[PDB]
Amino acid sequence: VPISFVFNRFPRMVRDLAKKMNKEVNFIMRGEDTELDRTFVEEIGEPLLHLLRNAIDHGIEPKEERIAKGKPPIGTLILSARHEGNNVVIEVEDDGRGIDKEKIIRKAIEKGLIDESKAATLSDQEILNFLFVPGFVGMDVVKNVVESLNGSISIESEKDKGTKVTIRLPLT
């Protein structure tokens, strides 16, 4: 049915978390009327909650830090669903600090997952996909659930600008 069944839980969760961390967050939900199979509605909640929490906690910076960096004091967190053909696309986008791709590469080298010699030409997708590696509620589990639903997940991010996580599910 409508994804609002999941999305309606989130405003109070988001607001509670932002408050606790001295963040002002404009949380915008779009496409809440988007319908898809009830299995997906029943299961996508916990993964989305992790992404929202990540954005508030790790993404959106404290107001003082936003001001210091010359960003709007209020951060923006957008949760959207839409139809794209026979798939539904769910996006979680924030205008926070972004994911530090350099830090990912440094850790992958440290963990012996890649050699330094390969770092210079790694694609952005290949870098950000290390986030799904176990040990790198967890981001690994987010991907495992999405893929159990025959979905896919990708991440785009730019330092200091923010992060967008995209989930594609079938309508099934």
Ligand SMILES: Nc1ncc2ccc(OCCc3ccccc3)cc2n1
């Ligand atoms: N939206 C956003 N913005 C900045 C981030 C910066 C780092 C990031 O990973 C580290 C935190 C993490 C914990 C447990 C499982 C997965 C990831 C995630 C981030 N996400």
